[PDB]
Amino acid sequence: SQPVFASPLNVEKRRLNEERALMQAQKANIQLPPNYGDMDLILFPEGSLKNSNNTVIPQSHLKGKSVALYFADGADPKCASLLPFLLNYYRTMNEGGANQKIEIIFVSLDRDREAFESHRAHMPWLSIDLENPLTEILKRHFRVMKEYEVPTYGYGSRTGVPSVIVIGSDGREAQFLPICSGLEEGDRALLRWDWRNTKFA
Amino acid sequence: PTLPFHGESAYRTDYVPKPLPEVAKPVEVKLPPTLPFNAQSCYRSEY
């Protein structure tokens, strides 16, 4: 139920959670329907996250780390302008430290597999496969949209391409980094990141 | 002799019945399409 309710991550997370609750009720005073805090979610299945070498890693690989989704489109000129600054930020954040601080999960708004590959070969962080349904299920969750090709459920059109959003363990938003928002200080909003209190616990 | 007649008047051969204008060019196509609504307030968008 965060940040919105009528989105498919939350519909599936609800369904799995009250089927768990009815399972434990039928097996055994149990409160129905389950609380938003008491429900549970796995954000990425076993074959979602892939790094630059195209080796898959699961969710627990991101523990103790500030994980941010990056919605982007290869042909988009905002995206083309933003990408080198994000590269520099990611670089100078994860070089000078005892350990690794942040990760960037690339979510693609592209049109074709080869366009996805060409816009992916310039990125050293992780990404999401285009034909995997997780990319547009995350689009519908976080209300990112370039133009109305999906029927909206009375949403807010939060942001367009590109965006970086700090995500939590169950898929909520921790903070929005304002590139194209109410605030719109593009190319500098990366420094608003608070990677200590934003952690994928 | 028996010289015959042709002396037809101005109006009898000058304002004859005429081929009526072929009615055409009925231009009508459509209104332009409408775009969807994606605008929100402040209180519901951020609070």
Side-chain angles (χ1 to χ4, degrees), chain B residues 13-29:
Chain B
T13 196
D14 205 340
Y15 290 173
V16 294
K18 309 302 303 314
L20 263 65
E22 182 65 26
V23 55
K25 52 190 180 297
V27 62
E28 190 276 331
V29 64

Side-chain angles (χ1 to χ4, degrees), chain A residues 145-187:
Chain A
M145 182 179 72
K146 66 175 75 68
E147 182 65 26
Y148 190 73
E149 313 161 353
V150 58
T152 187
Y153 291 143
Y155 291 170
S157 63
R158 158 55 71 90
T159 187
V161 56
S163 306
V164 64
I165 183 59
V166 171
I167 65 171
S169 308
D170 57 66
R172 75 278 190 188
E173 61 77 10
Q175 75 183 122
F176 193 30
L177 266 71
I179 303 166
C180 307
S181 78
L183 181 51
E184 293 179 353
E185 82 306 350
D187 287 324

Side-chain angles (χ1 to χ4, degrees), chain B:
Chain B
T2 58
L3 188 153
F5 186 85
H6 64 279
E8 290 71 29
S9 309
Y11 183 75
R12 304 268 313 279
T13 196
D14 205 340
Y15 290 173
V16 294
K18 309 302 303 314
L20 263 65
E22 182 65 26
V23 55
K25 52 190 180 297
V27 62
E28 190 276 331
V29 64
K30 208 48 187 172
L31 268 162
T34 187
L35 61 83
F37 191 88
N38 324 297
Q40 290 80 23
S41 70
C42 286
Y43 179 33
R44 323 221 310 280
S45 69
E46 65 183 1
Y47 264 121

Side-chain angles (χ1 to χ4, degrees), chain A residues 10 32 39 48 84 103 105 114 116 131 157 164-165 167 180:
Chain A
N10 310 127
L32 268 297
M39 294 187 288
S48 302
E103 285 316 324
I105 309 298
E114 61 252 15
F116 174 66
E131 68 270 14
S157 63
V164 64
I165 183 59
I167 65 171
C180 307

Side-chain angles (χ1 to χ4, degrees), chain A residues 54-72:
Chain A
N54 294 47
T55 61
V56 65
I57 61 170
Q59 189 147 314
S60 66
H61 274 256
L62 292 177
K63 185 97 198 192
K65 195 142 41 183
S66 187
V67 169
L69 288 194
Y70 169 60
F71 306 100

